[PDB]
């Protein structure tokens, strides 16, 4: 019934930039005033920054500000900081004396632009404890890199692996705006013990980095 | 002033969810409370609103299945939703949203997983650092948390005393239908012989906690 449309759906900005997020209501809000802005950081609950269109909550830094009128509202981050990486939501209150509704915007992910940073690459053999249960997980860690896009390939005795690995990526770090990534190669214990050299290759741009270990040597 | 949330967790399809939020430091009858939900990796969605006067209004999509009540005697507000499907899996919140007033309170949220699978605790294995660093003074270690259901697991290091350089990755769904994640930390390699490193893995859905000392080699 009631809709709020935010724009853009995502954006990328540098530290110190001014960020503007708009929110467009399908109808008039309650008393033309009940509009709030929320901020959600990775793995956290939403935190209210602005209420009543433009009132700043006491726990929120003053570089946040709200504005707007009628059915068009605006949240403004005057000087973007790394800890401002989050998804931002407007929420509106609607209805009459016999009707009460809330509606959220679909959210605006704010990404932090930053200099390129090469990952520190670590490779972990399967633990002896896991091998006792017939399965071997080899883990390759890409630590603190930027940008996000990166190609990770597994090699077992120089044979390229396919279909037996999974990747997981963090969101931008709240302090240095970098990413981290893990890639887990899942083999059976029988398979793992039939091979010697295990290697994970990371390709970004014009650079490839390969970290390897030999099974049974330390 | 606090709002503590309870219930939820693992629910089977076609079943019902019942969630409560107990107010402490104030009376439930004094504010209007919404229920909101957020599917994994999606946005926030409003379910219904119970005014301070006790009237319940629901969003259209939720009207036919949702009921929001409050018990002034127990000082609680409660959401009930039936005929659950996998599409209803989400983190659910009770909240006075504070859209136009200075007061805003949220429960901590609780993940409701709609699934017919059974609960399974995690296997924790060490991601051991080599005794001699290969990365110029910085050593990586961690814990692999494998084969658990449902979500979530929380991981800390040294009971929360170690937070710098910790990366706890989002869980991935394996082909078995079970979840797995890793938590890693980068430390100075000179500390490998001195400092004890213990990952604390808490899987509340199975009432299991694991504390693993990750030792070199």
């Amino acid at each position: 019934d009631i809709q709020m449309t935010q724009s853009p759906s995502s954006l990328s900005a540098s530290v110190g930039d001014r960020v503007t997020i708009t929110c467009r209501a399908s109808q008039s809000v309650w008393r033309n005033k009940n509009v709030a802005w929320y901020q959600q950081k990775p793995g956290k609950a939403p935190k209210r920054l602005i209420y009543a269109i433009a009132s700043l909550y006491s726990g929120v830094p003053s570089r946040f500000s709200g504005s707007g009128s009628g059915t068009d509202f605006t949240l403004t981050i005057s000087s973007l900081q790394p800890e401002d990486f989050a998804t931002y939501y407007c929420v509106g209150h609607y209805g009459s004396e016999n009707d009460a509704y809330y509606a959220f915007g679909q959210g605006t992910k704010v990404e932090i632009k930053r200099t390129v940073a090469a990952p520190s690459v670590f490779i972990f053999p399967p633990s002896d404890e896991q091998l006792k249960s017939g399965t071997a997980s080899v883990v390759c860690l890409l630590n603190n890199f930027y940008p996000r896009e990166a190609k990770v390939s597994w090699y077992v005795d120089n044979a390229l692996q396919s279909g037996n690995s999974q990747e997981s990526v963090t969101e931008q770090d709240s302090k240095d705006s970098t990413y981290s990534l893990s890639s887990t190669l899942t083999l059976s214990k029988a398979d793992y013990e039939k091979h010697k050299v295990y290697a994970c290759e990371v390709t970004q741009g014009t650079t490839s980095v390969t970290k390897s270990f030999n099974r049974g040597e330390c | 002033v606090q709002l503590v949330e309870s219930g939820g967790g693992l629910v089977q399809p076609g079943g019902s969810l019942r969630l409560s939020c107990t107010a402490s430091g104030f009376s439930i009858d004094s504010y209007g409370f919404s229920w909101v939900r957020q599917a994994p990796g999606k946005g926030l969605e409003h379910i219904g609103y119970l005014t301070a006067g006790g009237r319940a209004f629901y969003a259209s999509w939720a009207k036919s299945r949702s009921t929001i009540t409050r018990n002034t005697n127990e000082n609680t507000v409660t959401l009930k939703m039936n005929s659950l499907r996998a599409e209803d899996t989400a983190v659910y919140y009770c909240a006075k949203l504070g859209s136009g007033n200075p007061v805003a309170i949220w429960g901590q949220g609780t993940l409701v997983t709609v699934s017919s699978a059974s609960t399974k605790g995690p296997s924790v294995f060490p991601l051991a650092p080599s005794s001699k660093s290969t990365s110029g003074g910085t050593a990586a270690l961690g814990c692999l948390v494998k084969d658990y259901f449902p979500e979530p697991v929380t991981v800390s290091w040294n009971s929360g005393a170690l937070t710098s350089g910790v990366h706890t990755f989002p869980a991935v769904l394996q082909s078995s239908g079970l979840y797995s994640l890793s938590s890693v930390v980068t430390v100075p390699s000179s500390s490998l012989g001195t400092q004890t490193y213990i990952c604390n893995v808490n899987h509340k859905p199975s009432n299991t906690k694991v504390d693993k000392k990750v030792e070199p080699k």
């Binding site: 009940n34 609607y94 009459s96 004396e97 009707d99 509704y101 | 209007g32 005014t51």
Partner: peptide
């Protein structure tokens, strides 16, 4: 009032 639906 502060919110709608109060009557």
């Amino acid at each position: 009032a502060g919110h709608a639906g109060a009557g």
